[PDB]
Design a protein around this ligand. Structure first.
Ligand SMILES: [Cl-]
Ligand SMILES: [Cl-]
Ligand SMILES: [Cl-]
Ligand SMILES: [Cl-]
Ligand SMILES: [Cl-]
Ligand SMILES: [Cl-]
Ligand SMILES: [Cl-]
Ligand SMILES: [Cl-]
Ligand code: NA
Length: 129
């Protein structure tokens, strides 16, 4: 599924991301825009042989099982395919464990490079929330 801009902001708020561990709604929308263009079916392969999955691009080295990442862990206790659903629940729950690991939203490199410090509120302007 490809979400409308105002449509995803509404679903993320419903699942309790608005200010989780101190991060506002526009930070999560911006992160999704640049990680996936609002597409839940987004995937991308990393050089160490791990893979990234879904609207927020979560990785198989630590966080999910895909059966193809040697010596890895499954700290979220889930298969990576759950991160591709039109239902965003598994993606939101695992992003909560990751953002708590010690380093906050710096765990997402594109958030640090395209959305940290910017007028993130513009991503929610004109939306009925
Ligand atoms: Cl847009
Ligand atoms: Cl915001
Ligand atoms: Cl594995
Ligand atoms: Cl393969
Ligand atoms: Cl494990
Ligand atoms: Cl599994
Ligand atoms: Cl949803
Ligand atoms: Cl933090
Ligand atoms: Na794994």
């Amino acid at each position: 599924k490809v979400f409308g801009r105002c449509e995803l902001a509404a679903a993320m708020k419903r699942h309790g991301l608005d200010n989780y561990r101190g991060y506002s709604l526009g930070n999560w929308v911006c992160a999704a825009k640049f990680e996936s263009n609002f597409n839940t079916q987004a995937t991308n392969r990393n050089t160490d042989g791990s893979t990234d999955y879904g609207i927020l691009q979560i990785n198989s080295r630590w966080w999910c099982n895909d059966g193809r990442t040697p010596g890895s862990r499954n700290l979220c206790n889930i298969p990576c395919s759950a991160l591709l659903s039109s239902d965003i629940t598994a993606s939101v729950n695992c992003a909560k464990k990751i953002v708590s690991d010690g380093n906050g939203m710096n765990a997402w490199v594109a958030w640090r490079n395209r959305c940290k410090g910017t007028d993130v509120q513009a991503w929610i302007r004109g939306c009925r929330l």
